């Protein structure tokens, strides 16, 4: 079980908010789960009993799972290399 | 406005076989970074 609230603060932005309008009928959404977010505990000691706890709340981490294979590049057409040639006059 | 029909509570369902199998498949993977004889437990966080 859980609860639903209308007004939300997504991208918290203390200075603004948004109101959720009602939706007619009923909603039955089906989706997938592709990843999880985990956070380690404190540095108590060298204990084999290690607990992993879900985190979340950071939007930057959400997109890091989809753009981890990409890296922008800057192309420099100019190039220099020795060669045996002479410019005639 | 007014509610038509019975009053229920929203909820969600997940298959037990699929969920446990995924955890059992990922738990072994994480042991490589930390250790082979490492006990793993999962918590649910608190008020935020």
């Amino acid at each position, epitope marked *: 079980p859980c609860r639903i609230k209308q007004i939300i603060n997504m991208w918290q932005r203390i200075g603004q908010c948004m109101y959720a309008p009602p939706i007619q009928g009923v909603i039955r959404c089906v989706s997938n789960i592709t990843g999880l977010i985990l*956070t380690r505990d404190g540095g*108590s000691t060298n204990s084999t*009993t290690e607990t992993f*706890r879900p985190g979340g709340g950071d939007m930057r981490d959400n997109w890091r799972s989809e753009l981890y294979k990409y890296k922008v590049v800057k192309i420099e057409p100019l190039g220099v290399a020795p060669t045996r040639c002479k410019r005639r006059v | 406005g007014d509610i038509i029909g019975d009053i229920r509570q929203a909820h969600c369902n997940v298959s037990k076989a699929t969920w446990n199998e995924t955890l059992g498949k990922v738990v072994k993977q994480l042991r490589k970074h930390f250790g082979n004889n490492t006990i793993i437990r999962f*918590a*649910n966080s*608190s*008020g*935020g």
Partner: antibody
Amino acid sequence: QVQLQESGPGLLKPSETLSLTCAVSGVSITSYPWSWIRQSPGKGLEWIGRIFTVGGHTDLNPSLKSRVTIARDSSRNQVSLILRSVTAADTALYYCARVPFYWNNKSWYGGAYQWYALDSWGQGVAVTVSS
Amino acid sequence: DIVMTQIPVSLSVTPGEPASISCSSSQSLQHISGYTYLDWYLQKPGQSPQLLISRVSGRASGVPDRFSGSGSGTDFMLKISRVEAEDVGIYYCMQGTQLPFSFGQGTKVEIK
């Protein structure tokens, strides 16, 4: 290793404000906090209260909530206990110790610090309350 | 406010003979989405008390190559691999679940 020392009057009189001070060693108050532990002959150990670098919560035993008090002083580098209305079973030993370990993360109450331990205990306080 | 029970109250054991002790509680010691807080303290007469076992099994530091306790709890237990000549004193069981951080009764030890 860091060793603590207890302080306070030796001879005490009944129905007097008992001020017991724990001599905080090199490790300052800003570091790991302390706590007060009560001893009692012929009975099990009893709890007094905790303390923190910034105080605040400072949970104490409900039984003696309205009688005992814990105060801190960064400048004096000492922690004191105020007690009045003594009882017959007050002729016992008082122990002062700290909490070594901590356990927290980014999800537990947003970085809240959890302490669960008792460090090396003190030498104890010997008292003799009588006429 | 909860009362602890220590069993056995009086223990006699020859050196080299492993010994076991138990601590019990009524309310479960499983913290809210956390661990179980319980420690064993040794009260050597004429010496300062020390902490030997942390959490439920974690050994902080020092001598504990001879003390080892585990188990979910309720009726908490502790085990000793071997008894050394410096194992003389009075034991103690402490529970710090939510409110009191109270202690137990104690248990004496006899050497042969």
